[PDB]
C-alpha cells in the first residue's frame, strides 16, 4: 500500500551504504551528476553530496518477512545517522 507504511521513516546505515555505493558506481560509469561538482572527482564523495541534498534518484523496496514490501524514496527517508 502507499499509505499505512509501518516501517521507520529514517534511512538505515545499510540503506545509506548501498545507496551511496550504487550511486557512486553510476557516477564512476560517467552518469550525469545532479549536484555541482565543486572540485569533486571522487564518485563516493560526489554521491555523498547528492545524498546530503537528497538528489539521489532512488527508491528503497523494504521487503517484509511474508514477502510483501513497502516502497520508500530517498527523499522521503530521513538521512540522519
Amino acid at each position: 500500500p502507499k499509505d499505512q507504511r509501518a516501517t521507520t521513516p529514517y534511512m538505515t546505515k545499510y540503506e545509506r551504504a548501498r545507496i551511496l555505493g550504487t550511486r557512486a558506481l553510476q557516477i564512476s560509469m560517467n552518469a550525469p551528476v545532479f549536484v555541482d561538482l565543486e572540485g569533486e572527482t571522487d564518485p563516493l564523495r560526489i554521491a555523498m553530496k547528492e545524498l546530503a541534498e537528497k538528489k539521489i534518484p532512488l527508491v528503497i523496496r523494504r521487503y517484509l518477512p511474508d514477502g510483501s514490501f513497502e516502497d520508500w524514496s530517498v527523499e522521503e527517508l530521513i538521512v540522519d545517522l
Binding site: Q26, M29, A31, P32, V33, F34
Partner: peptide, 26 residues
C-alpha cells in the same frame, strides 16, 4: 525536473526500465 540531465531520452519511449539494473545508468 528542470534538470534535463535527470531524464533519459530512451526512457521517454519506454526503452528504459528504472527499476532494472539491466538498463543500467538510469
Amino acid at each position: 525536473p528542470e534538470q534535463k540531465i535527470t531524464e533519459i531520452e530512451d526512457g521517454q519511449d519506454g526503452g528504459v526500465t528504472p527499476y532494472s539494473n539491466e538498463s543500467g545508468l538510469v
